[PDB]
Structures are given as C-alpha cells and as structure tokens.
Write a protein that holds these residues in place. Structure first.
Motif, mmCIF file in Angstrom:
data_model
loop_
_atom_site.group_PDB
_atom_site.id
_atom_site.type_symbol
_atom_site.label_atom_id
_atom_site.label_comp_id
_atom_site.label_asym_id
_atom_site.label_seq_id
_atom_site.Cartn_x
_atom_site.Cartn_y
_atom_site.Cartn_z
ATOM 1 N N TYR L 116 0.831 -1.193 0.000
ATOM 2 C CA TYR L 116 0.000 0.000 0.000
ATOM 3 C C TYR L 116 0.869 1.247 0.000
ATOM 4 O O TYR L 116 1.984 1.255 0.524
ATOM 5 N N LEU L 117 0.342 2.299 -0.619
ATOM 6 C CA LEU L 117 0.986 3.602 -0.653
ATOM 7 C C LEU L 117 -0.064 4.664 -0.371
ATOM 8 O O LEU L 117 -1.267 4.429 -0.506
ATOM 9 N N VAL L 118 0.406 5.842 0.026
ATOM 10 C CA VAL L 118 -0.461 6.962 0.374
ATOM 11 C C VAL L 118 0.051 8.199 -0.350
ATOM 12 O O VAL L 118 1.191 8.624 -0.126
ATOM 13 N N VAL L 119 -0.786 8.777 -1.209
ATOM 14 C CA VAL L 119 -0.425 9.985 -1.940
ATOM 15 C C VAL L 119 -1.431 11.082 -1.616
ATOM 16 O O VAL L 119 -2.495 10.834 -1.049
ATOM 17 N N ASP L 120 -1.068 12.315 -1.959
ATOM 18 C CA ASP L 120 -1.979 13.439 -1.769
ATOM 19 C C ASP L 120 -3.111 13.391 -2.790
ATOM 20 O O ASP L 120 -2.911 13.001 -3.943
ATOM 21 N N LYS L 121 -4.308 13.798 -2.358
ATOM 22 C CA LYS L 121 -5.462 13.771 -3.253
ATOM 23 C C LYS L 121 -5.305 14.722 -4.435
ATOM 24 O O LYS L 121 -5.852 14.457 -5.513
ATOM 25 N N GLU L 122 -4.569 15.825 -4.265
ATOM 26 C CA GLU L 122 -4.320 16.708 -5.401
ATOM 27 C C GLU L 122 -3.529 16.000 -6.483
ATOM 28 O O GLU L 122 -3.696 16.288 -7.674
ATOM 29 N N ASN L 123 -2.671 15.062 -6.087
ATOM 30 C CA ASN L 123 -1.775 14.393 -7.020
ATOM 31 C C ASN L 123 -2.560 13.323 -7.777
ATOM 32 O O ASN L 123 -2.421 12.117 -7.563
ATOM 33 N N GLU L 124 -3.414 13.803 -8.683
ATOM 34 C CA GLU L 124 -4.172 12.895 -9.530
ATOM 35 C C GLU L 124 -3.255 12.208 -10.529
ATOM 36 O O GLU L 124 -3.534 11.083 -10.962
#
Lengths: 167, 167, 167, 167, 167, 167, 167, 167, 167, 167, 167, 167
Positions: L116-124
């Motif tokens: 699993y990874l976690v990215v910022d929601k802006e980073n579409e």
C-alpha cells in the motif's frame, strides 16, 4: 637545567623501553614485561590516582629518566621514591639531581613527613650516594625480591622532612 | 578447635565493629573510620582480588578474630600477615593459634617463600609472641605510622618457608 | 559516654530530619531542603570520598548529633569542622564533647595541621563554645551567606595541631 | 582589545604549561602537577559544571592568561576569582584589565553579589593592586596553604556588587 | 501548623492522585495523565535537578497539598510558583499559607529576585487572592493553554524580593 | 643477539599469519582459523591476564618467532611453554635460543618451579632437542589431540627450577 | 536412586562447604579458600560456559556429591572428570555410581572421545578404583601440584568412548 | 534566496561565535559563555529533542543567522521564536525574511496555534518591526532578565495561526 | 461512575488476560500471544512514549476495560482509538461510555484534530454504534489483517474536532 | 593453490557485493538485502561465534569466493556447508576445489562427523557435481524457500567423516 | 478444555524439570542439562525473539505440556513444531490436541505456509500420529543426532497451509 | 539499467538533501526537517530493524532516488511503499521503474501479500500512474495530513500478490 615534569601519555613509549629492560627493571624489583597497550591502560587507570606522582626526568627537552613518588600515604605523610635513569643518559649526575628534585617535591610540595627508597643490598654504591644526599639506612629486607633466579635482600633507606629542610 | 575460614560478606558487620574500634585499629596502623557500606563496597571490589586472603578466625562457630594475608606477591613469594583478636576473646591464646594457621596457609597452601608482619615497637608482647611462633625481627621503620597524634616506629618481622618446614 | 561513629546509611533518616530543619540548617549555611532519596544518593556518591569524615555523635547508643570533617586537604592539612546537635539533646554539653572528639580525630588520627569552622556572627553562643575548646577567631567573611532574606557575615575560626597537642 | 573567551578544550595545552609551573602554581595554591590527559579529563568532567567559568585571557588572538570564576554559589551569590598571566605576557597590564573584565562578568552577567580572591600574604603588590581595582581586604587565613616547604598565610579580599556598580 | 517539606519519593502516590484529576490539573495547565511509574521515574530523574523545589504542603503530619518552585533561574533570579491544594483539604486557607511559605522560601532562602505564577483568566478568585498576598498582575497570555476543548488565556502575576521584605 | 620482547598489539599482524598456517598450528594443537579482529579482541581481552606471557622472538629488529608462557599457575609455580619459529626463519637455531630465553624467564624472572611443554609424539626431533636443553619426557597423552583427521598422542616434557639452575 | 542433576545456584552453599574443606580440596588440587560470594559470582560468570558440566550428585533428594566435566574440548572431544563425595555420604559407593553416571554423560550425551581425570600419586586406592571402572593410567605429572607444603606428583588416567561402549 | 536549513553539527562553530558575543547574547537573554565542547555536547543531547527546531538562516551558501523554534508545546500548540543575525550580515533585511520563514514553518509545517517571541523593552524598533510582520504585543515581563548589570523588562509578542493564514 | 485512568504497571496482569484472549485480540488485529514479562518490558519501554495514552476503563474501582489512544501524531493532530471491554463487563454500555471519554480526552485534552479507529468489516454492529456516537465510515482496507486463517477487510472510521465540539 | 582463509573484516565489502546480488543469493536462500554497516555489525557480533567458520576462497591473492561452515553443532558433530563463487571467477573449477577444501576442514580440523548442504532442486547440475564430489542426496525439502515469487523445494545432501577419510 | 497459553517466566521450573529429563529431552534432540538460572537467562534473552512461540499446554489450570513454534521464518513462512507432554499427563490424548492447537496457531495466527517437525526414526508411533493429524513425511536425516551413545537418523515431517485449510 | 540497492550509511548525505526539501518531503507526509546527525543516528538505530527496507534507486552508478518498504508486517504480510525521485532525475520514467522494482521486491522477495501507498489527493497524476502500474485506489483519508498550512486528504492505494503475479 634538569627538571621533573609529569609523565605524560605521549611519553609512555620511553617508559615502555625502560619497563622491558631487564637490567633497568632489576634496580626496581619489577618483572621486565609490559606490553605497550598494558602500560597505556594502567596509566589510564592511574591518571586520577593521587597516591602516585610519575615524573619524566627531563634535560634540555630530552627524556633522561623516570622518577616515581608512589604509595603516597596522606595520613602518615610518607611516600616511596623510585628512580630510573636511561643508560644512554647515565654518567651526567642525573640520578642525584633527580633524587633531589623528587625530595624537594615530596617534602615541599606534597608536605610529606618521610621519603623512603628501596635499593638492592648488592648496590652498595647507591646506598653510599643516597647517604651522601641525606638518606639514612633504615633497614634490610631479607630475601625480599626474586631477581634473576635468586632471592636478593634490599636496603630500605629513609629521609625526613625536618632533616631535609635543615639541609 | 580454632579454625580459619574465608571472610564472608555476611560476616562484615563483625569486621565493621573491629574497623571502627580505635584501640583495635591501632595495632594495625589503620584509620578507625569505615562506614558499613564503605566496607561492604571495598569487600565487593576485592572479591576476586587474588592478592588477598581474608580469614575469619573462628572458635566454636563464633567469630573471634580476623587474619589477613594481604599484598600476596606471586613472583617474590611474600605476603603481609595481619591479625586482630576480638577484645572479648583475648587472653585465650587465640592470637598464637590463628598466627600459626595463617603461617601454615601461606607456606603450605599459597606456597609463599616469606611472611612479613608489622607491629608497634612498643608492642613487646606481640613481638615476643611472633618470635615464639618463628618470626625474626627483620627491621625497624622509623616514624612509619602516624598513630594517636604521634609518629610511631614499627618493627617489621619476617619468617621463611624453610624455617617453617624445619618444624 | 559521648562517642563519634561513622555516619552510616541506615542513619540517614536522622540526618534527613536535621537537613530539613531551617533553624538547624541556619547554623550551617545550607539550604534547608533535601529529599530523602537525594540525601541517600549524595551519601552513596561520597562513600569513598576521602575528603570527608561524617560522624554520628552518639550518646548511650542514641544518635544525638552529626559532626563532619569536610574539605579534608591532605597537602595543606586542613579541614572544615561542622557540628549539629539535635535540639532534643541540647543542654547536655554534647556540643563541646563532640567538638573535642572531632578535634582529636582530625589532629591525632587524620594528622591535620589545621581545623577551621565557619559560624554566623550572630551565633555568639557557638563562638563562645569554640573559643572554650581552643579555636581562635581567624577572620570575618562579609555578607558571605544569604540567610532568611539577609546577607549575613560569618566568623571563620581555626585551631592548629601544635597548640592542640600542647593543651 | 584584550578580551575574555571560554577556555576551550583545544586551549588546554596552554593551561597545561601553566599548571606545571611551580612559580605560577604558587600564586594559586595548587600542587604544580597535572598530566595533560589528567587536565583534559577534568576539563571534560567539568564541561557542564555551572559552578565554574574558565576564561582564556586573549590579546590579539593570542592566549596571554587564564581567568577563573570558580565556586560560583548561586544562592549566596558569590564566586572566587583567580587569575594567571603567562610570565612572558606580564608587564602589559593584562592582569588588571582581565581582573576588570572578570569583575564585570561576575557582577553584570552572573549577577553575583560578592567576588572574593585569595592571594599570598607575601604578595603585598597583588593586595595593593586589587585594592586599587576596588577589592577590600576581607581577612587573613593563618597557615592556610603549604607552599614550597612552608605554611603560608593568605589574604582573602572581596568586592561587592553595589560598590562595583557605583564606580 | 501548616508547613512545607520536601516532596519525598514515598509521597509520590499522593501526587499521582492529584496528577490524574482533570479538575485539579486544570489549575495548572497540565495534561491529567501520568502513570505512577512515569511520575516515579520523572521524580528520580530530577532528584538532583536544582531548577526545582518540590514541596508537600503538610498540616498535622497529613499531605494537604503540593507546592512547586520550578524553572528556578539562578542568573535572572526568578522562579515559577505553582500550588495545588487537595480538594478534600480546601476551605481551610491552606492555599494562602502554603503560598506565603513558598514566597518566604524563594525570597529568603533561594535569594530570588522575582516570583511569578500563571493562572487561568477565568479564575478571578485566584487572581484576587494572589493580589491579596502581594502578587502583582504582570501580563496576560492570549490562547496560551488548551484546556477542555478551548484555548484559554492566562494571567501571569509576579512579586519581587524588595516589596516582599517590605511587607 | 636473539631476544624476547612482549607481544605487542602492533605485532598481531605477524601472529595472524602464524595462527592461520595449518602446518605451524599443527605443532601447537590449534585449529588454524582466526580472523584478525578475533585475534585482536582476544589479545585485548588478555592484556591484563597475568596467567600469560606472550613474547615476540626478535632477531635484529625482525619478528622471527612467538614464545608463550601460558597457564602460569602462581601457587603450583608451573607454566606451559610453547614456541613457534617463522618458516622463513627456520634453520637458524632460533628455536633452541628462544627456548633457553623462555626457560630463563620462567625460572629466573617468574620464579616458576616447573616448565612443561607438549609436542606431537611423531615430532621426535622436538623431543630430542628439548631433552638436549634439559627437558625430561614426563608422560604421553593418548589420542589427546585431533589433528588433520586423526587422533594424535602427545609427549609432555618437563623441566624444573633446581635442575635448570644447576645447569 | 543416585542421579546427576545440574549444579543449581541454590545448591552453591553445599559446594561452598566442599570448597573450603582443605582435606576435600586436596584431592582436587584447588586452594581451599572461596568466599560464598566469590563462588556465587564465578558460578554466575560460567552459567553459559559450555566447556563445563557441573552436577550435583543427588541420592534420595539429598546433595551427596559434586561431579564436574570441565575443560570440555569439542574439537578433540575430551573432558576432564572430577568428583567429590561429601564426607558424611562416603562409604555408600556413591563415588563409583556418580563416576559411572558422569562417564555415561560425557560419552553418550556429550559425545566425548576421551575422558581424563587427575588424582594424587599418593592416592593409589583411587587409582585402583578408577582401574576397576575402566580407566587406564595414562601418565604421571612430576611435582605438578603444591599441596600442604610439598610438591606432589599426579596420576592422570584416561578412558575412551569405543572401549566404554564395548563395556 | 534566503532559506532556513537544519542547524547541523558541522555548523556549531558559527553558533559558537554567536554564543560568545555578549551583544548578540543580549537580544536573547542568555549568558554569553559557552565552551565549544559544551555547545557540541548540548547539541548532541538535543539531537532527538522534538521540542526544538534549530535553523541556520542561509543566504547564498553562507550562514547568516540562527532561528530557533523552541519550547514547542504539542498540546497547547505554541512555540517560542528566537532569531539572531550575524553582525556582519545585518542591514540586508535577513532578520525579517528569516522571521517570516520561521512563522511559515511553525504555522504551516508544525501546525502551531501560537508563536511567541521575547525582545527587550528598550528595543522598540524590533517591537515595531514584529508588529509589521504580524506579531501583536502580548505582554510585558517586569525585571524578567538580568542583562549587563541591570534588571530589564521584556516585551512578549505573539502571533496566531488564523491571522497568519489570513495574511 | 465510569472513568478512564492511566494504565498502571500493577494493572498489567489484567491487560495480560486481555492480550492472550484470541477472541478479544481479534477485535484489535493483534496476535494473541504475549508473555507477562514481555508485556511488562514493553510497558516499561513505553513509559515515556508520548505517542500513546493507555487507559484502564474503571467502573466502581474495578478494571472493566482498556482504552488506547495510540499513534498520536502531534503535527497532523490525529490518533488511533482502540477499545476493549472485558467480556465479563460487556452489556453495561461500558464500551460507548469509554469511547466518549476517550473522544473527550483526545479532542479536549490532547487537542487532536482527528480520531480514527479500525474495526473488522464483519462488525457492522460496531460500525453502527460508532456512527451513533459520531464516527463516519472513512474507508475500507482490503485484506489488511490476517485473522484466524483468512484475510479480513477492515472499516476505518474517523471523527473530527469541530463536529465533536458542535455536538 | 586455491586456498581458504578467514573472512576478515577488511573483506566484508566483497561479501557485501555478493550479499546484494539477487542471482547469487538465490543459490543460498537468502534475501538479497544487506546494508554494508549491517553486514559489518553482524560480522562483529559473530566474531567469537564458534558455530561459524567464514572463509574467503582466495586464488593468487584474489578473493574468488566465500565458503561458510555454519550451524556447527559440536555435540551432533554436523555442519552446514555453503559456497559462493564470484561469477567473474566461475568456470575455473573453483567451486569443486573450495568445496573439497571445506570438506577437509570440517572433517579433519573441526573433526566433524557430518557435512550437509542445501541447494535448489532446479539446480540439478550442482546436485550432480556434489554427488561427483562425494555428497549423497539425503532428502528433499518441499516448498522450503520462497524464491523470486514462487515456493521452491530444496535438495539437502550430506557426507560423512568415515566415507571422506576412506576416499 | 485443553488450551495453549504463553510460556511465562513463573512456569520455567516446570520447563526445568522437562529440560533435565534425558528421556523427555530425547524426543527433542536436546542435551538434558540446563541449570535453572541458565534456563531463566535464556528465556529472558528470547523474550522479544519473534522467531519463537513458547506455549504451556494447560488442561484445567495445570501445566501438562510444552509446545514450541521455533525458527519462525517470516519470509519463507515456515516454523518448526516441537511438543513435550509430561509423562504424568501422557495417555490422555493431550499430545494430539496440543499439536492441533499449535497447527491452528501457526497456520491461522502466524500465517505460516509450512509447519515442520523432526522426530526420531525409532518413534514410528509419533510418525503415525502426526500423519493422522495431517503431517506428511518430508524426509530422512541420516545420523543427524547423537543420542544416548549412538548416531540416530530423524524423520522430518511437514504440513502446509492449503492442505490444513482444505479441511 | 535502473536498479535498487540498499541505502548505505555513506549515501545518507543524498537522503539528507531530500529530507530537507519541503516540496519533496510533502509528497511523503513528513516534516521537512532533519539534521544530518539526526538522520545518521536514526539510520544506525534501524540498521537491524526488519520492519523496513530502504533502497537507493540507482541509475548509471548514480543515486537518483529513494524507495522505502516500511511498516513491513510479517504476520499480515503487508508493507507501505514510498518513493522519492530527485527532481534533477524526473522525466526519465525512474519513478515507474523504481515502483515496479519495489513491487517485485516486496511480492517476490519479502513474500508480501499486500503493498500500500499513500499519496496526496491533489496528485491525480500519481494516482493515475499507480493505477497504470497496477495499484487500486483503496480509500480516502479525510484531513489525514497537515501539509503547508492546510489539512489534506490522502488517497491510499493498494496492490496484492496474486494480481501482481498475474501481470
């Protein structure tokens, strides 16, 4: 002018050679074996040992000897004096001058009541020299030290603070 | 039968009473001050010190004295013998028997060549006892110990393994 | 008979009660705060500190005071003498007897050349007691200690070994 | 401009040379013996000792002296002032300037109520100089220090914060 | 009579109960969580912390409160005063007596120039009481502490040594 | 002249190659594996182990061998003698001279009553040579050491202090 | 039924009594001195020492002896067997049963190729007993141990795994 | 472009000079004494202290200042902002830009609710500048800091997260 | 009244019983194995860990549950909430009351912006209860935890500070 | 002369490159991750681990491989043999020569009864080579190792001391 | 109902009795020697060893057995299963129930892909029992363990997660 | 060819530059502050931390990125994937290749069931890239991270071992 300075860690190599010379380690009654790291570690252990005063006998920025005021008793005000002069620097009277410097240090600085030294009974010349400087023959230790395969007797000589300050 | 046993940690309280008795700590030339925790910590420090043999002198499962073979030199084969008899157990000849057991231990067990002791020069009774047990007057130490406000000389006496084997 | 014994760890509770009494801790110029574990830990820190001699002043197997020979200098041969008598045991002359025992210990056992103490100039009773035992007013320290909101001067008094042994 | 800076570890060699000069280590009443590793170890041990302020007296980026504000009491607001000027840098008034800098540091930075110093009674010049700088003769310590074989008395001088700020 | 004594380790359980009461731990702006072993270990770590003076407020050998002189600055000569009175012992005026004792300790014993405390702005009763004992409102800290879901402002009050000695 | 000196830490590199030579480490009954850091750590661990005397056999400032007086028992006064001569320095008679130097050290310096050595029973040359220097075949150890896939017996030889001093 | 169990720390008192019996500690060639804390510390130090297997010889839930498989070499597959039977439990044949159990452990559990023991040459009865159990006299050590004032020779006896499994 | 980076250990020398400039250490109310090894040791002690964020203010690869977000409270969400600009880099507006960088770091990165700073009350220019950047005068601390011989009051100014995010 | 108190060391046995119940350790996704000394050592390791707040849920002086606010992030202002009610105390509404107490603690005391919890996808009843208390289903973790031989999905739910203070 | 020497610390870089080659770390069933400091720390940790014998396979002063005799059981007399040949040194028969040297070391030096190795079942060529060297297929481990995303079985092969000495 | 619980320190005495029974310590191929303090120290060393899961097999609050999931490899997903039932509790089917619980724990809790056990080939009954619970004969280890004087072969049996979950 | 290698200590400087870049350390939700000694100390602390696998993404013998498989749970077989590409090396597809290498390492080497990874929601763009690589959007975390002054939601994406092996 010959002086006494503290035995520094960087000087230990010099001491090392003295500690592995059997002839030198016969005047003191010490086993002539000490690895350099062993000597270093013991020196580190006794850095803050106030019972000891280890001196390099120095002449013209040169290590000519080792003078030790050991077993410094601060209640009885006595200390054992030991001296080694490097054989390459023998014959200059360094022994007597270093002995007088150590006597002045123990009596005038350390406020000692008594200084004592231990020499071999065979070394009658050293006894005569120490008597000339003011040491009195205090006693004889029978078979006190095992040196080069035989039990040697020792002459313990002593000097006192009043006799030193008068002279 | 009088016996020597190892000085155990649980025995230290007894030693404590001896180490803070000024009269007792005058025969040995020791300052009569030792907190119990100080004695305990020093005992712990010397648990594995092979230069020492600390003995409770025991008679009928009761601690009547303290015998110490200290400064055990394993090259020169000499050790200092020290003795204290509890004042409540003095007059029973415990001193001579404990001295004989300590001599047997140093000569027969520790394989020592020499035993030496230091007594007060005034202590004529102890000097006679040690001469009866086999010790010879070896020398006199001038102003060796500061005791009760005055510098006292000491008699250093010694005995050897051959003389012990003669008896 | 009044005696001095080593201050043992088990005694610290007593000292604790003395160390948090503001009136008692005004005689000595000490802040009257010490948690019991703090006092215990400092005692452990100075178990093998030879600059100190901490004494329980004991009368009839009961702790009546605390006598300290601190700042023991073994080259200059001087020590600071401090004494506390429990208020429950004042009026029995315990102060003078404990002072005389401590003087005898420092001069005769510790081989000290000088004893010095520092008391408040307001404490004329303590100054008189110390003058009765032989102490001489050595000097005055101006505004030396901040006590109860004001800078107090102190009287430093001293005694010497020769004058003590003469009397 | 002459300045005071913290005594850094890299400076200790300088301190070393001062600490084994018997003449220099006589104004301060210190035994003139300290191995370099001993001085280093003590410096490291006292890195976070807030009772001390060790200063290199520096002139033109050169170590000309050592100024110490030791025994800083933060309740009684007093500190002992000590100063050494290297003998090769004496005669430039560095002693007085460094003394004034140390006084300003203790009174203005450390918020000390009192500064005190201890000089030899023979050193009448130092007493006069410190009186010129504002120090008052506070008292005399009898036979306080054993220096070069004799017991020397000392003059303790003091200055206070109000008198310093007024001038 | 109400007294302050050192906060001992054996007392910590009491402090524990106070340190986990949210209402009590709201007067001080502290999170009302502390495991007993956490409090014990923090107490042990600060045994020799001289920045702190922790007091049990005791009345008739009973723990009625906790007074803390913390953040003791020995250069600026100021300390933060904090006080808790056990809710079971509220209404006896113990707070005012303990506050006066702490003021006397900080100004007369610790030689502090300034005492300051921080209370909630809503606690107008505490502000009024501290004005009655001699504290001056020094300032207001905006949104300084997060208490029970809201940012609370605080009133910092101060008193000085000269005005305290005058009153 | 061939001499013995203490095995120094800086010499360990030499020892390393000797300790990983299967042929050499077969004369001694040692597994021919030792990482250099392992040898270094063991040497550091045994710096102050007095049961050992590790010697570099030196000829003209060159490390030609390793002589070890190990298992030095100071009560039974015996030690095991072991010797290795570097293979590029074989054929120079260094083995016998180093053996005599080690014998003189153990008997005359360490005051040993007995020296014993252990060679392979197949190594008749060593038994013959050690008999020439004075060692007597003391006993045979059956299947004592597993060497190169086979259980080898060993010849234990001994010499005593009286017979050595007579010869 | 007689069994071997691990020598537990809780058993050490028993071992203590054995370790200070001079007569008992003469069959093994050990100095009959060991403080209880010394034995305890050595036991703790060797808890994870795999070179040794220390056994309480137990009969009917009673500690009747001590059997040690020491110097266990895992490459050469040999171990030294030593045995003591408490004098109050001698005469029950416990020695032979414990010896056979120890041999079964070393040969069958530890997979040892060789077991060896060392007895006094004067103790011909023990040599005969060990021959009865299967041990062969392997060699004689001349003046190997200093016991009760004299140098004693020792008989080293050995047994092997193949001969043991055949019998 | 002016930036904030972590205060690295290799930078400490720079900090060292700032920590020994009395004028610099007057803006912060810190004693201008710190040995380099003392600063190093404190930095090492606070490497993992999350209550602080120490920043080198860097301009064109040059250390021009020091910004500290200390006393970071993560429950009350406040931190003290402190700033020093090297005297050689003053007049470039580095102070204001670094202050704005620290404000952005505390509010946007550390999610702080409040930033507070403490300047000297005489420094009205700094107060006006901080009001220009968004700080509000929060309060005045009377006689809060002893600076250069006098008790100085301080102006504590604060900024909050909402007004900063609005601007 | 049901309350939350700090999880004390003496309470760990209770936690122990909870941590080895497979059914209980399924709600939390923890392996149901923990030796008591293991749990004690981890508790000691996290005594000063500020990332967690461990609570005993207590009702009528009885340990009825365990509430943990773990992974407390002080920059992102979020913490994971976990709760266990002892099965013997289920059915009293203790779960919801403890959940509201923990929410009040995280939002009002710890100043958390967000609380999140993770339950098993099978526990739709807990999801409904948490939605009743105010938690919103935030997301689903696919095969996040291996429980009793199968990968279970989890429901991660969250609640925020503003919605909590509004309700 | 293909040879085995001890794996020295200075060699670890070489091992490092082998320990992070996924293809090389597939023959051994090891995860191909090891930071250099991690390998160094593990090497230092196992310096005195006698269960291990780590060998650099060296040919003409060049490190061509790594041979490990691990899991050395000194009671069951078996060891796991592992070998890696650097791919740049493959095709010279170094694998067989190093394997035979390791077999000779375990059987003849370490006196091992059994050697075993574990290779991948897909590596039928290696199984055939070890059978040519004397190893017998002992067993198959089903799904023993997770290799590159799939569970791989392994062939465990063994050799014994008697058959090795016969050939 | 028979259950598995963590092996606690307080249970070690039970384990102790099992670890010194040669018959019990034959099923596992362990040397039947472990002093209680040795077992305690090893238990403490592996408290946080996640490669191990030590279980007391308990029936009606009584310790009837010991189950170990050791050598837990978390990448290869395998663990060795070992089981001991105390002979006084054998014959109740406790062995099979504890084995089933251990299989359920390794497959369902630890998420192991493979379980393996090693039994003696003489114990065909154990092989049959493990085949009844689901274990497959995986291989044979020739002369793998030296037990009671002879080299015994072992049967290694294995079971897998898929085959376990299919039923 | 782009490769992953272990993050070595000598590489930390590179990591340092990445860990203090605010823009870079916002994609990961990390505070952009780390002193070099802090990063070094944490790296040393986690050398043997098996919960993490830190990789230098290397292209043409050059460190172009940092890939971390952290929070490796060995029971649930999941790990968090994090990646940073140096901005100077973006646009070469290094992110996707390093992501595939990390996926292969976690699934094939570490045998992980889930990444699993976690990215910022802006980073579409990153979400689209990871969906192209095989990651599925698992959930959305509301106000999960405080970044640059605002609460940002995050998209948590996941991939499983079977779906990866199928593709």
């Amino acid at each position: 002018e010959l002086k006494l300075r503290p035995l520094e860690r960087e000087d230990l190599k010099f001491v090392h050679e003295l500690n592995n010379n059997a002839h030198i380690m016969s005047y003191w009654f010490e086993e002539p074996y000490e690895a350099f790291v062993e000597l270093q570690d013991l020196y580190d252990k006794h850095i803050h040992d106030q019972s000891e005063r280890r001196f390099i006998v120095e002449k013209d920025n040169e290590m000519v000897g080792l003078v030790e005021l050991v077993e410094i008793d601060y209640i009885h005000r006595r200390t054992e004096f030991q001296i080694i002069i490097d054989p390459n620097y023998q014959g200059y009277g360094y022994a007597v001058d270093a002995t007088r410097l150590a006597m002045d240090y123990a009596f005038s600085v350390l406020n000692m009541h008594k200084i004592y030294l231990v020499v071999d009974k065979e070394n009658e010349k050293a006894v005569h020299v120490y008597k000339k400087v003011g040491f009195m023959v205090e006693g004889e230790l029978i078979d006190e030290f095992f040196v080069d395969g035989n039990y040697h007797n020792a002459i313990r000589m002593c000097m006192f603070q009043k006799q030193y300050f008068e002279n």
